Amino acid sequence: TQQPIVTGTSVISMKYDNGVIIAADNLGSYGSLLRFNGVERLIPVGDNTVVGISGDISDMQHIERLLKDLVTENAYDNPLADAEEALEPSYIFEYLATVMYQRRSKMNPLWNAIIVAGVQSNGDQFLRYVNLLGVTYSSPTLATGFGAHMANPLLRKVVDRESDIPKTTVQVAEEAIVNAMRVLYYRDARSSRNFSLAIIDKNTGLTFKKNLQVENMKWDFAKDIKGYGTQKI
Amino acid sequence: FRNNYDGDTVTFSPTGRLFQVEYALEAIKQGSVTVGLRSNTHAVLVALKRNADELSSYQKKIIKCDEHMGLSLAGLAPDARVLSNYLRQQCNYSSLVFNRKLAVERAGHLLCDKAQKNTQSYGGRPYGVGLLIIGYDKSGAHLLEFQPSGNVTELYGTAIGARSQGAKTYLERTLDTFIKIDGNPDELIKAGVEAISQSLRDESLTVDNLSIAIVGKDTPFTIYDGEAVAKYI
């Protein structure tokens, strides 16, 4: 049993007709201190998978190392490592899920909330969540922590059920996610304005965007607000 | 000579030989013949079951390791049980942890390594059994030949056991032919039975004497014994 020290906030994601999109800001908080700002919480594995991690950062770095090893190991005595026998998003997820549950069962968890986003070899979109309890689930949209309360409601307005996926384009999807990131910056006291976003399309492959920023924010109305009730000036 | 260097597997002879390993290999030759061959859609195992008395049963020679993999044995049955059981676990582990079916090539590597440990240490003994492994994985149909020396090889077809050389020359000749028997199991099986009968001498393959197994594209590894093999005698 432990307690998280340096932490990453929300990880939001959703699937569209040809793939999945996932994003996470670049902050590493230390309690209420917004300590680190160049933290990448989106971990690409191969070119068909991206693992988004929230929670304890030291554990995240540990999962990072685990992931690099999987790649190395899978390459050993594997002549089809970059083909039929390359790592699938579902393999990467089942692995992590396995680890997460074993660690909670030993009463020594990896204090994280993880979302694995990717495209299977047959083109199917893959989006599943696993956390420090070993709990797992899938949904057209998935968000961790804070984004579960504020991002899912927005993303679900785009893809409310399975039949909505084929009707959603990368543009609409990326738009929804980018807007969600802005909302999270408005109400989440542990968020950052900078973030990374990744897209895994069954055609265009993996697109990884770094150094994005929340833009087009509305703050002007703040000038018209004074006092907390009766004050006039 | 030999006598002074064949007391255990941990001793090299003056010529660089490992007699205990070679003696183990001899147990295979004394084993009943079995054949293996594959096309691009299927893989077949044909084994001649041997009986003790005419009041006894014909000992099973095919073991299923998973829905997509299995093997035939020639030599010490108990050793086949041990090795196949290890293979069952390895297949199982791959599924439970990575939600991935184990590659036939990987299974060959694991078997090679398990057998090797029993040829470099004192106290143990080499395994005294030969195995033919077939399976359908992410890269198609496969056939492997496992020797107690730890040497595993991938082939289009082969045979092991007493008088196996007959069937092997037949296959090495029928190559261009059977390798193209795609989409037609019964044809591949008949081809297998024709290869195995090339090693007969004592009797002729009967109903409770013939044993067949197949795996492929849309065929889960399954065993046919008795009445079920009649249509091939």
Short mmCIF file of C-alpha atoms in Angstrom, two decimals:
data_model
loop_
_atom_site.label_atom_id
_atom_site.label_comp_id
_atom_site.label_asym_id
_atom_site.label_seq_id
_atom_site.Cartn_x
_atom_site.Cartn_y
_atom_site.Cartn_z
CA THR A 1 0.00 0.00 0.00
CA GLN A 2 1.22 3.43 -0.88
CA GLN A 3 0.12 6.95 -1.72
CA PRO A 4 0.65 8.80 -5.00
CA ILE A 5 3.14 11.67 -4.96
CA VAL A 6 3.64 13.18 -8.43
CA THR A 7 0.44 12.82 -10.42
CA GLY A 8 -1.07 13.19 -13.84
CA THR A 9 -4.70 14.21 -14.19
CA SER A 10 -7.31 13.19 -16.83
CA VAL A 11 -6.80 11.02 -19.91
CA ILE A 12 -9.69 11.34 -22.37
CA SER A 13 -10.49 9.32 -25.50
CA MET A 14 -13.09 8.13 -27.97
CA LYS A 15 -13.36 6.12 -31.14
CA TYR A 16 -14.51 7.32 -34.58
CA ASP A 17 -15.28 5.49 -37.84
CA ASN A 18 -11.65 4.74 -38.78
CA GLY A 19 -9.85 4.67 -35.46
CA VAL A 20 -9.40 6.17 -32.04
CA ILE A 21 -8.17 9.45 -30.57
CA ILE A 22 -6.62 9.92 -27.13
CA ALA A 23 -5.22 12.94 -25.28
CA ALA A 24 -3.71 13.99 -21.91
CA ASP A 25 -2.19 17.25 -20.67
CA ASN A 26 1.55 17.61 -19.94
CA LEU A 27 1.38 18.23 -16.21
CA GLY A 28 2.92 16.40 -13.26
CA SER A 29 1.34 17.78 -10.08
CA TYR A 30 2.78 17.47 -6.59
CA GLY A 31 -0.25 17.95 -4.44
CA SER A 32 -1.54 21.45 -5.16
CA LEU A 33 1.82 22.46 -6.65
CA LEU A 34 1.81 22.32 -10.47
CA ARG A 35 5.42 21.12 -10.37
CA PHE A 36 6.39 19.60 -13.74
CA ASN A 37 5.36 20.83 -17.17
CA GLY A 38 7.02 18.69 -19.79
CA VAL A 39 5.45 15.40 -18.81
CA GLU A 40 4.33 13.17 -21.68
CA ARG A 41 1.57 10.86 -20.47
CA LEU A 42 0.76 9.34 -23.85
CA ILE A 43 2.95 6.28 -24.47
CA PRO A 44 3.07 4.97 -28.06
CA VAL A 45 3.77 1.26 -28.45
CA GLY A 46 4.75 0.26 -31.94
CA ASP A 47 2.58 2.11 -34.43
CA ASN A 48 -0.90 0.81 -33.68
CA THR A 49 -1.13 1.54 -29.97
CA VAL A 50 -1.00 4.44 -27.53
CA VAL A 51 -1.26 3.97 -23.77
CA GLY A 52 -2.53 7.01 -21.87
CA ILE A 53 -1.63 7.08 -18.17
CA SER A 54 -2.94 9.07 -15.20
CA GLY A 55 -2.13 8.82 -11.52
CA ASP A 56 1.29 8.29 -9.95
CA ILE A 57 4.09 9.38 -12.27
CA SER A 58 6.82 7.21 -10.80
CA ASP A 59 4.57 4.20 -11.47
CA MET A 60 3.84 5.59 -14.96
CA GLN A 61 7.56 5.64 -15.70
CA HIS A 62 7.72 2.08 -14.44
CA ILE A 63 4.93 1.08 -16.83
CA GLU A 64 6.88 2.85 -19.56
CA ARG A 65 9.87 0.62 -18.94
CA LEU A 66 7.60 -2.44 -18.87
CA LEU A 67 6.25 -1.40 -22.25
CA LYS A 68 9.66 -0.91 -23.86
CA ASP A 69 10.57 -4.41 -22.66
CA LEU A 70 7.49 -5.97 -24.16
CA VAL A 71 8.62 -4.62 -27.52
CA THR A 72 12.18 -5.88 -27.10
CA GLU A 73 11.02 -9.27 -25.88
CA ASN A 74 8.43 -9.67 -28.64
CA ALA A 75 11.20 -9.09 -31.16
CA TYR A 76 13.31 -11.98 -29.81
CA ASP A 77 13.41 -15.02 -32.13
CA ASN A 78 10.46 -13.47 -33.98
CA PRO A 79 10.97 -13.08 -37.75
CA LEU A 80 7.44 -11.62 -38.03
CA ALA A 81 7.91 -9.01 -35.27
CA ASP A 82 7.13 -6.19 -37.68
CA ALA A 83 4.31 -8.09 -39.36
CA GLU A 84 1.88 -10.85 -38.35
CA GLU A 85 3.57 -11.22 -34.96
CA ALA A 86 3.87 -7.58 -33.95
CA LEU A 87 2.23 -6.43 -30.71
CA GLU A 88 -1.52 -5.89 -30.94
CA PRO A 89 -3.25 -3.24 -28.78
CA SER A 90 -5.26 -6.05 -27.18
CA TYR A 91 -2.07 -7.91 -26.18
CA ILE A 92 -0.60 -4.79 -24.61
CA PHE A 93 -3.81 -4.19 -22.70
CA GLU A 94 -4.28 -7.73 -21.44
CA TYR A 95 -0.69 -7.58 -20.22
CA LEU A 96 -1.11 -4.36 -18.26
CA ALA A 97 -4.50 -5.48 -16.96
CA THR A 98 -2.85 -8.64 -15.72
CA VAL A 99 -0.14 -6.67 -13.94
CA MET A 100 -2.55 -4.15 -12.46
CA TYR A 101 -4.69 -6.89 -10.92
CA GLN A 102 -1.73 -8.88 -9.59
CA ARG A 103 -0.33 -5.74 -7.97
CA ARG A 104 -3.62 -4.83 -6.28
CA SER A 105 -3.86 -8.44 -5.12
CA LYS A 106 -0.50 -8.15 -3.39
CA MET A 107 -1.76 -4.98 -1.73
CA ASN A 108 0.93 -2.98 -3.55
CA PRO A 109 -0.76 -1.26 -6.52
CA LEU A 110 0.53 0.73 -9.46
CA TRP A 111 -1.43 3.87 -8.56
CA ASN A 112 -2.73 4.57 -12.04
CA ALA A 113 -5.74 4.82 -14.32
CA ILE A 114 -4.84 3.61 -17.80
CA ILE A 115 -6.55 3.71 -21.19
CA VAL A 116 -5.18 1.70 -24.11
CA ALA A 117 -6.08 3.11 -27.52
CA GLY A 118 -5.29 1.45 -30.82
CA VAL A 119 -6.27 -0.39 -33.97
CA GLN A 120 -6.19 -4.17 -34.23
CA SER A 121 -4.57 -5.89 -37.21
CA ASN A 122 -8.01 -6.47 -38.77
CA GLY A 123 -8.77 -2.76 -38.50
CA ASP A 124 -11.04 -2.93 -35.45
CA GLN A 125 -10.76 -0.02 -33.03
CA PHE A 126 -9.50 -0.85 -29.55
CA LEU A 127 -10.33 1.19 -26.50
CA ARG A 128 -10.23 -0.26 -23.00
CA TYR A 129 -9.57 1.05 -19.48
CA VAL A 130 -7.78 -0.56 -16.50
CA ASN A 131 -6.94 1.01 -13.12
CA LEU A 132 -5.08 0.35 -9.86
CA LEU A 133 -7.83 -2.05 -8.74
CA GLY A 134 -7.49 -4.17 -11.86
CA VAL A 135 -10.97 -3.05 -12.93
CA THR A 136 -11.52 -2.94 -16.71
CA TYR A 137 -14.18 -1.79 -19.17
CA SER A 138 -14.86 -0.56 -22.69
CA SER A 139 -17.08 2.17 -24.06
CA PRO A 140 -17.25 4.32 -27.23
CA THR A 141 -15.70 7.02 -25.02
CA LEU A 142 -13.42 6.62 -22.01
CA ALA A 143 -11.89 9.16 -19.66
CA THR A 144 -10.09 8.87 -16.33
CA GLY A 145 -10.45 10.85 -13.12
CA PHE A 146 -11.81 14.35 -13.67
CA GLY A 147 -12.48 13.81 -17.36
CA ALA A 148 -14.86 10.99 -16.45
CA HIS A 149 -17.19 13.58 -14.98
CA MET A 150 -16.75 16.37 -17.52
CA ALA A 151 -15.34 14.90 -20.73
CA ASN A 152 -17.50 11.79 -21.12
CA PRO A 153 -20.74 13.83 -21.07
CA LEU A 154 -19.45 15.92 -23.98
CA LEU A 155 -17.91 13.09 -25.99
CA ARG A 156 -21.05 11.01 -25.50
CA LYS A 157 -23.05 13.78 -27.20
CA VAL A 158 -21.07 12.83 -30.33
CA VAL A 159 -20.94 9.04 -29.90
CA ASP A 160 -23.74 7.96 -27.53
CA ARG A 161 -23.85 4.32 -28.62
CA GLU A 162 -22.08 1.86 -30.91
CA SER A 163 -24.09 2.82 -34.02
CA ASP A 164 -22.65 6.33 -33.71
CA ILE A 165 -19.03 5.30 -34.35
CA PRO A 166 -19.33 4.76 -38.12
CA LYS A 167 -21.06 8.14 -38.37
CA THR A 168 -18.18 10.00 -36.72
CA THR A 169 -15.26 11.51 -38.61
CA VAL A 170 -11.75 12.21 -37.37
CA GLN A 171 -12.53 15.92 -37.69
CA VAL A 172 -15.66 15.81 -35.53
CA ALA A 173 -13.92 13.50 -33.05
CA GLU A 174 -10.72 15.52 -32.78
CA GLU A 175 -12.88 18.59 -32.37
CA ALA A 176 -14.86 17.08 -29.49
CA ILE A 177 -11.70 16.01 -27.69
CA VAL A 178 -9.96 19.35 -28.16
CA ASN A 179 -13.04 21.12 -26.75
CA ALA A 180 -13.11 18.70 -23.80
CA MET A 181 -9.48 19.54 -23.06
CA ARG A 182 -10.46 23.21 -22.85
CA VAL A 183 -13.36 22.51 -20.51
CA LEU A 184 -11.06 20.47 -18.28
CA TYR A 185 -8.68 23.44 -18.18
CA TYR A 186 -11.57 25.66 -17.07
CA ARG A 187 -12.76 23.55 -14.12
CA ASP A 188 -9.97 21.10 -13.14
CA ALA A 189 -7.58 22.68 -10.64
CA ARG A 190 -4.92 20.11 -11.52
CA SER A 191 -4.87 20.64 -15.29
CA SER A 192 -2.42 22.27 -17.68
CA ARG A 193 -3.03 24.30 -20.83
CA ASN A 194 -0.51 22.21 -22.79
CA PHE A 195 -1.26 18.70 -23.91
CA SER A 196 -0.50 15.90 -26.34
CA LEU A 197 -3.01 14.22 -28.63
CA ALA A 198 -2.69 11.06 -30.69
CA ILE A 199 -4.77 9.47 -33.43
CA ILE A 200 -4.58 5.87 -34.54
CA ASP A 201 -6.37 5.48 -37.86
CA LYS A 202 -6.64 2.18 -39.72
CA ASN A 203 -5.54 4.06 -42.85
CA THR A 204 -3.38 7.03 -41.86
CA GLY A 205 -1.69 5.07 -39.07
CA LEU A 206 -0.51 6.76 -35.87
CA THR A 207 -0.38 10.56 -35.71
CA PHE A 208 1.17 11.94 -32.53
CA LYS A 209 0.69 15.66 -31.84
CA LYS A 210 2.83 17.32 -29.17
CA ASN A 211 2.73 20.81 -27.63
CA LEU A 212 -0.94 21.58 -28.28
CA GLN A 213 -2.65 24.36 -26.33
CA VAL A 214 -6.11 25.27 -25.21
CA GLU A 215 -7.14 28.20 -27.39
CA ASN A 216 -10.30 30.24 -27.99
CA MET A 217 -11.13 30.60 -24.30
CA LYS A 218 -13.95 32.83 -23.06
CA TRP A 219 -12.95 35.07 -20.13
CA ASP A 220 -14.26 38.51 -21.15
CA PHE A 221 -17.54 38.18 -19.21
CA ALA A 222 -15.39 38.08 -16.06
CA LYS A 223 -15.07 41.89 -16.30
CA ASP A 224 -18.82 42.35 -15.79
CA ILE A 225 -18.76 40.32 -12.58
CA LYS A 226 -18.06 42.18 -9.33
CA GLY A 227 -18.78 41.39 -5.68
CA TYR A 228 -20.63 38.29 -4.53
CA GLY A 229 -24.18 39.63 -4.19
CA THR A 230 -25.00 43.28 -3.40
CA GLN A 231 -21.74 45.04 -4.33
CA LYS A 232 -22.13 47.34 -7.34
CA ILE A 233 -18.59 48.43 -8.25
CA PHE B 1 35.82 -45.71 -25.39
CA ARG B 2 32.07 -44.93 -25.32
CA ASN B 3 31.58 -46.89 -22.10
CA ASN B 4 33.76 -44.38 -20.23
CA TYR B 5 31.87 -41.38 -21.56
CA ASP B 6 28.21 -42.46 -21.60
CA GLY B 7 27.54 -42.64 -17.86
CA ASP B 8 25.67 -39.31 -17.75
CA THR B 9 24.64 -36.30 -19.85
CA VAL B 10 27.21 -34.02 -18.28
CA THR B 11 30.10 -35.78 -20.05
CA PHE B 12 31.54 -35.09 -23.49
CA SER B 13 33.22 -37.98 -25.34
CA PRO B 14 36.67 -37.39 -26.87
CA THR B 15 34.99 -36.65 -30.21
CA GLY B 16 32.56 -34.11 -28.75
CA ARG B 17 29.57 -36.44 -28.50
CA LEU B 18 26.91 -36.76 -25.82
CA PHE B 19 26.07 -40.46 -25.65
CA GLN B 20 23.26 -40.26 -23.10
CA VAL B 21 21.54 -37.92 -25.54
CA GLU B 22 22.19 -40.32 -28.41
CA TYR B 23 20.85 -43.26 -26.40
CA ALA B 24 17.74 -41.22 -25.73
CA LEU B 25 17.43 -40.62 -29.46
CA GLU B 26 17.49 -44.39 -29.83
CA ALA B 27 14.31 -44.74 -27.78
CA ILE B 28 12.59 -42.70 -30.47
CA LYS B 29 13.73 -45.01 -33.27
CA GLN B 30 12.27 -47.93 -31.30
CA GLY B 31 8.98 -46.04 -31.21
CA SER B 32 6.00 -46.63 -33.48
CA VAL B 33 6.00 -44.51 -36.64
CA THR B 34 4.11 -41.23 -36.95
CA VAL B 35 3.83 -38.70 -39.78
CA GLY B 36 3.23 -34.99 -40.17
CA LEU B 37 2.53 -32.84 -43.24
CA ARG B 38 0.89 -29.53 -44.06
CA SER B 39 -0.44 -27.44 -46.95
CA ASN B 40 -1.08 -23.70 -46.60
CA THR B 41 -4.49 -24.14 -45.01
CA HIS B 42 -4.07 -27.27 -42.87
CA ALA B 43 -1.59 -29.43 -40.98
CA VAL B 44 -2.08 -33.13 -40.40
CA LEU B 45 -0.76 -35.69 -37.98
CA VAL B 46 -1.03 -39.39 -38.80
CA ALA B 47 0.19 -41.87 -36.24
CA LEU B 48 0.41 -45.64 -36.10
CA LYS B 49 -0.78 -46.75 -32.66
CA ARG B 50 1.06 -49.75 -31.21
CA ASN B 51 -0.55 -52.41 -29.00
CA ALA B 52 1.02 -54.76 -26.43
CA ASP B 53 -1.10 -57.94 -26.74
CA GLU B 54 -4.16 -58.59 -28.87
CA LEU B 55 -5.98 -58.17 -25.58
CA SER B 56 -4.49 -54.70 -25.07
CA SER B 57 -5.31 -51.27 -26.45
CA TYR B 58 -3.32 -49.30 -29.01
CA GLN B 59 -1.61 -46.54 -27.00
CA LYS B 60 -2.61 -42.98 -27.95
CA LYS B 61 0.08 -41.01 -29.78
CA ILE B 62 -1.61 -37.62 -30.34
CA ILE B 63 -2.03 -34.93 -27.70
CA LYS B 64 -3.91 -31.66 -28.07
CA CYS B 65 -2.11 -28.71 -26.47
CA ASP B 66 -4.61 -25.97 -27.33
CA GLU B 67 -7.39 -25.27 -29.85
CA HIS B 68 -4.76 -24.42 -32.45
CA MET B 69 -1.90 -26.76 -31.57
CA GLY B 70 -1.09 -30.40 -30.90
CA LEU B 71 1.53 -33.06 -31.41
CA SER B 72 2.39 -36.70 -32.05
CA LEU B 73 4.88 -38.68 -29.97
CA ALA B 74 7.38 -41.48 -30.62
CA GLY B 75 9.30 -42.96 -27.69
CA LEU B 76 8.73 -42.69 -23.94
CA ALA B 77 5.05 -41.83 -23.50
CA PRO B 78 5.55 -40.36 -20.00
CA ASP B 79 8.08 -37.89 -21.40
CA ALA B 80 5.56 -36.87 -24.05
CA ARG B 81 3.04 -36.25 -21.30
CA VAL B 82 5.49 -34.04 -19.42
CA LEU B 83 6.49 -32.03 -22.50
CA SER B 84 2.96 -31.70 -23.87
CA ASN B 85 1.78 -30.62 -20.44
CA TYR B 86 4.43 -27.90 -20.40
CA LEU B 87 3.25 -26.85 -23.85
CA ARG B 88 -0.35 -26.76 -22.65
CA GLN B 89 0.67 -24.34 -19.89
CA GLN B 90 2.74 -22.17 -22.21
CA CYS B 91 -0.18 -21.91 -24.63
CA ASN B 92 -2.46 -21.20 -21.70
CA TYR B 93 -0.15 -18.54 -20.27
CA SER B 94 -0.01 -16.75 -23.62
CA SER B 95 -3.80 -16.63 -23.72
CA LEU B 96 -4.45 -15.55 -20.13
CA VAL B 97 -1.75 -12.89 -19.94
CA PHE B 98 -1.57 -11.47 -23.45
CA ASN B 99 -4.86 -12.76 -24.83
CA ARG B 100 -2.71 -14.10 -27.66
CA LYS B 101 -2.53 -17.57 -29.17
CA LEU B 102 1.00 -18.95 -28.91
CA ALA B 103 2.98 -19.00 -32.16
CA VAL B 104 3.99 -22.51 -33.22
CA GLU B 105 7.49 -21.19 -33.76
CA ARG B 106 7.59 -19.89 -30.20
CA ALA B 107 6.36 -23.25 -28.88
CA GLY B 108 9.22 -24.89 -30.71
CA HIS B 109 11.69 -22.54 -29.06
CA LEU B 110 10.25 -23.22 -25.60
CA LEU B 111 10.42 -26.98 -26.10
CA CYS B 112 13.98 -26.73 -27.36
CA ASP B 113 15.02 -24.85 -24.24
CA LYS B 114 13.19 -27.16 -21.84
CA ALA B 115 14.92 -30.17 -23.37
CA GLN B 116 18.32 -28.50 -23.35
CA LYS B 117 18.42 -28.04 -19.57
CA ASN B 118 18.32 -31.81 -19.20
CA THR B 119 21.50 -32.27 -21.30
CA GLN B 120 23.92 -29.94 -19.48
CA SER B 121 23.28 -30.82 -15.81
CA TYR B 122 24.11 -33.72 -13.52
CA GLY B 123 21.37 -35.89 -12.04
CA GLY B 124 18.80 -35.46 -14.77
CA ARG B 125 18.39 -37.40 -17.99
CA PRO B 126 17.52 -36.33 -21.52
CA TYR B 127 13.92 -36.82 -22.58
CA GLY B 128 13.47 -40.07 -24.48
CA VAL B 129 10.76 -39.03 -26.89
CA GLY B 130 10.35 -37.36 -30.28
CA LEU B 131 7.52 -35.01 -31.12
CA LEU B 132 5.85 -33.69 -34.24
CA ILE B 133 3.99 -30.44 -33.58
CA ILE B 134 1.40 -28.96 -35.94
CA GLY B 135 -0.64 -25.82 -35.54
CA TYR B 136 -2.43 -22.98 -37.28
CA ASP B 137 -1.43 -19.55 -36.01
CA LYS B 138 -1.17 -15.96 -37.25
CA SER B 139 1.20 -17.05 -40.01
CA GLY B 140 -0.68 -20.10 -41.23
CA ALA B 141 -0.11 -23.84 -41.00
CA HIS B 142 3.00 -25.23 -39.30
CA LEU B 143 4.76 -28.52 -38.63
CA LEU B 144 7.69 -28.95 -36.26
CA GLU B 145 9.96 -31.85 -35.44
CA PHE B 146 11.30 -32.04 -31.89
CA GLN B 147 14.33 -34.15 -30.99
CA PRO B 148 15.36 -34.83 -27.33
CA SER B 149 18.71 -33.29 -28.19
CA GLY B 150 16.75 -30.05 -28.07
CA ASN B 151 16.81 -29.57 -31.85
CA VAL B 152 13.48 -28.42 -33.26
CA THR B 153 12.92 -27.88 -36.99
CA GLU B 154 10.09 -26.55 -39.15
CA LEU B 155 9.18 -28.63 -42.20
CA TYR B 156 6.45 -29.18 -44.81
CA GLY B 157 6.32 -32.78 -43.64
CA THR B 158 8.28 -35.53 -41.92
CA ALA B 159 8.13 -38.76 -39.92
CA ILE B 160 9.75 -40.26 -36.83
CA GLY B 161 9.83 -43.70 -35.27
CA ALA B 162 10.65 -47.16 -36.59
CA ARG B 163 10.96 -47.34 -40.38
CA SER B 164 10.08 -43.65 -40.51
CA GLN B 165 12.55 -43.31 -43.39
CA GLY B 166 10.00 -44.79 -45.76
CA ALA B 167 7.34 -42.16 -45.18
CA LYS B 168 9.98 -39.44 -45.17
CA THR B 169 11.29 -40.28 -48.66
CA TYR B 170 7.71 -40.49 -49.89
CA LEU B 171 6.91 -37.00 -48.59
CA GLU B 172 10.19 -35.58 -49.89
CA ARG B 173 8.94 -36.81 -53.25
CA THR B 174 5.23 -35.91 -52.91
CA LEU B 175 6.25 -32.42 -51.74
CA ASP B 176 5.17 -30.26 -54.69
CA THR B 177 1.90 -32.19 -54.58
CA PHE B 178 0.50 -32.14 -51.02
CA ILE B 179 1.89 -28.67 -50.22
CA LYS B 180 -0.89 -27.41 -52.49
CA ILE B 181 -3.73 -29.42 -50.97
CA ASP B 182 -5.35 -26.25 -49.68
CA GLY B 183 -9.01 -26.15 -48.73
CA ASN B 184 -9.30 -29.93 -48.81
CA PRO B 185 -8.60 -31.72 -45.50
CA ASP B 186 -9.62 -35.22 -46.63
CA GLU B 187 -7.05 -34.98 -49.41
CA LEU B 188 -4.29 -33.89 -47.04
CA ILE B 189 -5.21 -36.68 -44.62
CA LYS B 190 -5.23 -39.35 -47.34
CA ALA B 191 -1.82 -38.02 -48.40
CA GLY B 192 -0.68 -38.44 -44.82
CA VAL B 193 -2.00 -41.98 -44.59
CA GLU B 194 -0.26 -42.79 -47.88
CA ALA B 195 3.02 -41.55 -46.45
CA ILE B 196 2.64 -43.53 -43.23
CA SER B 197 1.83 -46.78 -45.01
CA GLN B 198 5.23 -46.31 -46.68
CA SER B 199 6.66 -47.39 -43.32
CA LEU B 200 4.41 -50.40 -42.74
CA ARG B 201 5.81 -53.93 -42.95
CA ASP B 202 4.36 -55.82 -40.02
CA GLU B 203 0.65 -55.31 -40.73
CA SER B 204 -1.70 -52.85 -42.39
CA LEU B 205 -3.39 -49.87 -40.74
CA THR B 206 -6.68 -51.02 -39.22
CA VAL B 207 -9.53 -49.09 -37.62
CA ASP B 208 -8.44 -49.31 -33.98
CA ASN B 209 -4.84 -49.04 -35.12
CA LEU B 210 -4.92 -45.75 -37.07
CA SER B 211 -4.90 -42.33 -35.39
CA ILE B 212 -5.31 -38.98 -37.16
CA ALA B 213 -5.37 -35.35 -36.10
CA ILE B 214 -5.87 -32.11 -38.02
CA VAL B 215 -5.80 -28.34 -37.44
CA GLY B 216 -6.32 -25.43 -39.83
CA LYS B 217 -7.89 -22.20 -41.10
CA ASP B 218 -11.35 -22.89 -39.73
CA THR B 219 -10.53 -26.18 -38.06
CA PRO B 220 -9.74 -26.46 -34.34
CA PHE B 221 -7.13 -29.15 -33.60
CA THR B 222 -9.15 -32.37 -33.40
CA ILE B 223 -8.37 -36.08 -33.06
CA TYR B 224 -9.95 -38.91 -35.03
CA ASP B 225 -9.69 -42.50 -33.80
CA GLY B 226 -11.47 -45.70 -34.80
CA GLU B 227 -14.74 -45.54 -36.73
CA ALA B 228 -13.89 -41.91 -37.45
CA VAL B 229 -10.79 -42.94 -39.44
CA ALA B 230 -12.48 -45.80 -41.29
CA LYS B 231 -13.09 -43.61 -44.33
CA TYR B 232 -9.30 -43.47 -44.79
CA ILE B 233 -8.36 -47.16 -44.52
#
